[PDB]
Design a protein around this ligand. Structure first.
Ligand SMILES: O=C(NN1C(=O)N[C@H](C2CCCCC2)C1=O)c1c[nH]c2c(F)c(F)c(F)c(F)c12
Length: 128
């Protein structure tokens, strides 16, 4: 009955409403209808990160990257996920790649990506 795009929009709305497991199930329904849309996996990965399901978030970022290798969001959310998992070198490389892709695509996220990079590099530094 609902379309894949309607389910993705319901998932986005539920995510803004802090209903992360419900949002993730909507994105799963969207994938069921159309499994070749990267943004359904990137957005579900952010749900999984909020739900502390890091392995599932990593897997969704990987599926998104197979579909859209230039995705700024897939690299950024993968970097944030890796940072929480203490995989610092990979996290920094993915955040740096999100920054380079955002600049190439003329996307403006304010200071979000350099801010995330400093947080990851400071955490890596403190750990070493
Ligand atoms: O996701 C970001 N914001 N955002 C939220 O917090 N809530 C919505 C949310 C709606 C449904 C789930 C997916 C997103 C949203 O779009 C970003 C903020 N700064 C970024 C950033 F620097 C990136 F490089 C990037 F790739 C980014 F995606 C972001």
């Amino acid at each position: 009955s609902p379309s894949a795009q309607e389910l993705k929009e319901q998932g986005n709305r539920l995510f803004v409403g802090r209903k992360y497991p419900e949002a993730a199930a909507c994105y799963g329904r969207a994938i069921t209808r159309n499994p070749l849309v990267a943004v359904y996996y990137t957005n579900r990965a952010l749900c999984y990160l909020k739900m502390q399901q890091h392995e599932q978030a990593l897997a969704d970022c990987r599926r998104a990257l197979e579909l859209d290798g230039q995705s700024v969001k897939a690299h950024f959310f993968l970097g944030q996920c890796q940072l929480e998992m203490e995989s610092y070198d990979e996290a920094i490389a993915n955040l740096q790649r999100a920054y380079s892709l955002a600049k190439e695509q003329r996307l403006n996220f304010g200071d979000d990506i350099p801010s995330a990079l400093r947080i990851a590099k400071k955490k890596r530094w403190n750990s070493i």
